[PDB]
Design an enzyme around this catalytic site. Structure first.
Site, PDB file in Angstrom:
ATOM      1  N   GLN A  35      49.603  33.299  38.837  1.00  0.00           N
ATOM      2  CA  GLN A  35      48.274  32.686  38.835  1.00  0.00           C
ATOM      3  C   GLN A  35      48.168  31.458  39.748  1.00  0.00           C
ATOM      4  O   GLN A  35      49.103  30.651  39.862  1.00  0.00           O
ATOM      5  CB  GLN A  35      47.836  32.333  37.403  1.00  0.00           C
ATOM      6  N   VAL A  36      47.014  31.329  40.396  1.00  0.00           N
ATOM      7  CA  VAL A  36      46.755  30.243  41.337  1.00  0.00           C
ATOM      8  C   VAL A  36      45.662  29.310  40.826  1.00  0.00           C
ATOM      9  O   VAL A  36      44.531  29.718  40.580  1.00  0.00           O
ATOM     10  CB  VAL A  36      46.349  30.783  42.714  1.00  0.00           C
ATOM     11  CG1 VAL A  36      46.054  29.635  43.684  1.00  0.00           C
ATOM     12  CG2 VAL A  36      47.430  31.669  43.262  1.00  0.00           C
ATOM     13  N   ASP A 143      54.340  42.997  52.922  1.00  0.00           N
ATOM     14  CA  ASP A 143      53.388  43.173  51.856  1.00  0.00           C
ATOM     15  C   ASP A 143      51.973  42.946  52.369  1.00  0.00           C
ATOM     16  O   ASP A 143      51.092  42.509  51.630  1.00  0.00           O
ATOM     17  CB  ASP A 143      53.745  42.266  50.658  1.00  0.00           C
ATOM     18  CG  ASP A 143      53.092  42.725  49.352  1.00  0.00           C
ATOM     19  OD1 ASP A 143      52.984  43.959  49.139  1.00  0.00           O
ATOM     20  OD2 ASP A 143      52.678  41.858  48.537  1.00  0.00           O
TER      21      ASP A 143
HETATM   22  C1  LIG Z   1      47.381  31.414  47.324  1.00  0.00           C
HETATM   23  C2  LIG Z   1      46.262  32.119  46.920  1.00  0.00           C
HETATM   24  N1  LIG Z   1      46.236  33.282  46.251  1.00  0.00           N
HETATM   25  C3  LIG Z   1      45.022  33.759  45.973  1.00  0.00           C
HETATM   26  N2  LIG Z   1      44.773  34.887  45.328  1.00  0.00           N
HETATM   27  S1  LIG Z   1      43.859  32.744  46.560  1.00  0.00           S
HETATM   28  C4  LIG Z   1      44.962  31.644  47.192  1.00  0.00           C
HETATM   29  C5  LIG Z   1      44.555  30.477  47.853  1.00  0.00           C
HETATM   30  C6  LIG Z   1      45.440  29.580  48.446  1.00  0.00           C
HETATM   31  C7  LIG Z   1      44.930  28.456  49.071  1.00  0.00           C
HETATM   32  N3  LIG Z   1      43.629  28.255  49.095  1.00  0.00           N
HETATM   33  C8  LIG Z   1      42.771  29.112  48.514  1.00  0.00           C
HETATM   34  N4  LIG Z   1      41.459  28.845  48.585  1.00  0.00           N
HETATM   35  C9  LIG Z   1      40.449  29.285  47.823  1.00  0.00           C
HETATM   36  C10 LIG Z   1      39.461  28.378  47.430  1.00  0.00           C
HETATM   37  C11 LIG Z   1      38.366  28.766  46.652  1.00  0.00           C
HETATM   38  C12 LIG Z   1      38.247  30.096  46.271  1.00  0.00           C
HETATM   39  C13 LIG Z   1      39.221  31.005  46.671  1.00  0.00           C
HETATM   40  N5  LIG Z   1      39.109  32.267  46.303  1.00  0.00           N
HETATM   41  O1  LIG Z   1      39.122  33.591  46.636  1.00  0.00           O
HETATM   42  O2  LIG Z   1      38.900  33.165  45.301  1.00  0.00           O
HETATM   43  C14 LIG Z   1      40.310  30.613  47.443  1.00  0.00           C
HETATM   44  N6  LIG Z   1      43.239  30.212  47.911  1.00  0.00           N
END
Ligand SMILES: Cc1nc(N)sc1-c1ccnc(Nc2cccc(-n3oo3)c2)n1
Length: 289
Positions: A35-36, A143
């Site tokens: 999770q992010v 990937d």
């Molecule tokens: C590392 C990573 N993995 C994801 N699934 S999104 C993500 C990531 C990494 C760095 N910055 C962001 N920005 C961001 C900001 C705001 C929204 C979203 N999203 O798609 O849902 C992404 N997303």
């Protein structure tokens, strides 16, 4: 078009610290990116993203530490940048560059009817740029699929590869461990338990190009076994009506990547040099439309 803006920090050689991310970062509990989690360096205010990777065994931990080590060698505007990392008993947290207003590429693809051919060409130059850089750094992604690519900005056509979970420095006799659940993105060498290398990424490039142009997955069948059948027969075509209006260059491009036998695929560098991605008089004609 315009090259993606860089991370708001210089490229770092990150080593995972023992301790809690919480002690130096305020991780958001409501803003989840994929999770992010969104997060902030407590001391500076700098906005970053926090990937909590759950790790069962020592081998799991070792895989992430390889991932860190790989990011360490990848300094490029189309590749997400590592900022810091933390190891606990049950997980390793990576703190990364945050992209404000990112949209994952599977979304862009679901909405492929929005894109002109030129739009796709431009997204493809960027994707190839990222891959060209990885390969010239002797690194395989392994990937490459839409869910691992972030559309930074739709208008500027800017992208960032945002996961390096399987990436590794090139070695001979690299066999992957794989699972055949939902296998539409697998290269035939991965499906056949053969060795992977640079062309393994170029197959995926082919796949993504096919998908941006049409919104369709080239090797998907009615079920997983049927999809595997398509990959192993290298069975695909451009007969769908979505492809009726595309340039010959586009068609030749994909033909130079969706090839069963690895050694025949063009490289990233050749992909960029290919008339689909490089021919100015073609992009002009494409603009005129
Ligand atoms: C590392 C990573 N993995 C994801 N699934 S999104 C993500 C990531 C990494 C760095 N910055 C962001 N920005 C961001 C900001 C705001 C929204 C979203 N999203 O798609 O849902 C992404 N997303």
């Amino acid at each position: 078009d315009i090259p993606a803006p860089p991370a708001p920090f210089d490229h770092r050689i990150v080593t995972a610290k023992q301790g809690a991310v919480n002690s130096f970062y305020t991780v958001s509990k409501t803003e989840i990116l994929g999770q992010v989690h969104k997060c902030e360096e407590t001391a500076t205010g700098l906005k970053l993203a926090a990937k909590i990777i759950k790790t069962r065994g020592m081998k799991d931990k070792e895989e992430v530490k390889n991932e860190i080590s790989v990011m360490n060698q990848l300094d490029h505007a189309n590749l997400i940048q590592l900022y810091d990392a933390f190891e606990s008993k049950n997980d390793i947290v990576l703190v990364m560059e945050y992209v404000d207003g990112g949209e994952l590429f599977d979304r862009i693809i679901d909405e492929s009817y929005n894109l002109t051919e030129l739009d796709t060409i431009l997204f493809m130059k960027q994707i190839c740029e990222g891959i060209r850089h990885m390969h010239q750094m002797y690194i395989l992604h392994l990937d490459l699929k839409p869910e691992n690519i972030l559309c930074v900005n739709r208008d500027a056509k800017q992208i960032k590869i945002i996961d390096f979970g399987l990436a590794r420095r090139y070695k001979p006799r690299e066999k992957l461990k794989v699972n055949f659940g939902t296998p539409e993105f697998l290269a035939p060498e991965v499906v056949n338990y053969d060795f992977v290398s640079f062309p393994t990424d170029m197959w995926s490039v082919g796949v993504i190009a096919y998908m941006l142009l049409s919104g369709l997955s080239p090797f998907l069948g009615d079920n997983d076994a049927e999809t595997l059948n398509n990959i192993l027969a290298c069975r695909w075509d451009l007969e769908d009506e979505e492809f009726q209006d595309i340039s010959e260059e586009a068609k030749e491009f994909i033909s130079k990547l969706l090839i069963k036998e690895k050694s025949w695929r063009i490289s990233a560098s050749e992909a960029l040099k290919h008339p689909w991605l490089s021919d100015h008089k073609l992009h002009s004609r494409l603009s005129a439309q």
